[PDB]
Design a protein around this ligand. Structure first.
Ligand SMILES: CCc1c(-c2ccc3[nH]ncc3c2)cnc(N)c1-c1ccc(O)cc1
Length: 329
């Protein structure tokens, strides 16, 4: 009834199915993934080709999509392979393969265009006039949730100044051991904002609030009047558990219109804003968000651009249709 299809439960894949729907509904990345030159690749060893198959299937199949060819291609086939890692590691590995496969193509640099943000790490000495400014690149933000009640407080703590005193004094080189202040300052925020909520260090289930609309202009060094840092909540990656028996589900409003759906493996059903947002705050049952996806209001239309059958090359279609014919025998 939703118009969207789900993914098969084929093991202890955990967060894998949740990330797959998250990336699929990042329409600009989906289009880009289809434009990859996979014609000469091996149907078993290729991760970029495996990511296209899942994306094509999710776009056309009425039946729950299989991920067996994907899990094999990046070598996470052991009983607890996904339990040894995190959603951030899987996404880093998956997107490194699709961006590496985009080199030389027209769609080269899709991943930095959507996920790269500009940061500045600084160490300013108190008693000495020496400052070490280190401009860094980031593709996601790891937010601490323990003690913090909401995203604003987590961002306040993220940009907060650290004191380098006594035993943890700063090596100012020629100025010797100096008492200094360490902090981070945001230069730019990416069109696709992936926020990792540090619930897993053990698993913390304390109440943590996130808004539907997130204004982040107050955390930037310099603000643009023509382009404010207003972010629209797109995906809510959820987990149910304490230490054992973990169930992973993802909530999405794919069009960014505020009309949400619950993506529980093979079962995709329409849900309220409450079920997707408020109900995944945690506290008091045991259900909470571990990862959030926000899209910049100005980039909402471009990131979530319409994807049709014509946006998939004939060479890709021909190969996956042949693969369907082989398995139909
Ligand atoms: C964009 C993927 C990525 C990269 C990364 C990987 C490959 C790349 N190729 N070009 C830039 C680039 C960045 C580096 N660090 C990360 N933390 C992440 C990341 C982002 C969102 C997540 O939900 C989880 C992880």
């Amino acid at each position: 009834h939703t118009g969207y299809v789900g993914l098969k439960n084929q093991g202890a894949t955990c967060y894998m199915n949740s990330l797959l729907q998250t990336l699929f509904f990042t329409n600009q990345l989906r289009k880009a993934v289809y434009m990859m030159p996979t014609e000469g690749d091996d149907s078993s060893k290729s991760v970029p080709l495996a990511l296209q198959r899942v994306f094509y299937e999710l776009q056309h199949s009425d039946k729950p999509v299989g991920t067996k060819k994907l899990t094999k291609s990046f070598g996470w086939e052991t009983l607890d392979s996904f339990m040894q890692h995190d959603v951030q590691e899987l996404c880093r590995v998956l997107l490194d393969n699709v961006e590496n496969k985009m080199k030389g193509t027209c769609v080269e640099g899709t991943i930095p265009k959507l996920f790269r943000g500009k940061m500045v790490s600084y160490i300013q000495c108190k008693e000495v006039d020496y400052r070490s400014d280190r401009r860094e690149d980031y593709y996601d933000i790891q937010l601490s949730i323990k003690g913090k009640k909401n995203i604003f407080e987590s961002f306040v703590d993220y940009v907060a100044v650290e004191q380098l005193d006594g035993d943890n004094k700063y090596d100012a080189g020629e100025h010797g051991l100096q008492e200094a202040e360490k902090g981070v300052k945001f230069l730019t925020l990416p069109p696709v904002l992936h926020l990792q909520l540090m619930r897993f260090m053990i698993k913390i289930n304390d109440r943590f609030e996130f808004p539907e609309q997130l204004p982040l202009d107050e955390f930037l060094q310099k603000t643009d009047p023509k382009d404010p840092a207003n972010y629209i909540l797109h995906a809510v990656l959820v987990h149910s558990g304490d230490n054992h028996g973990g169930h992973y589900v993802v909530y999405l409003n794919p069009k960014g219109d505020g009309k949400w759906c619950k993506f529980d493996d093979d079962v995709v059903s329409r849900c309220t804003k409450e079920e997707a947002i408020e109900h995944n705050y945690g506290g008091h049952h045991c259900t909470n968000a571990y990862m959030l996806v926000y899209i910049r209001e100005s980039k909402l239309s471009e990131v979530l651009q319409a994807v049709t059958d014509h946006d998939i090359p004939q060479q890709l279609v021909e190969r996956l249709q042949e693969e369907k014919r082989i398995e139909a025998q």
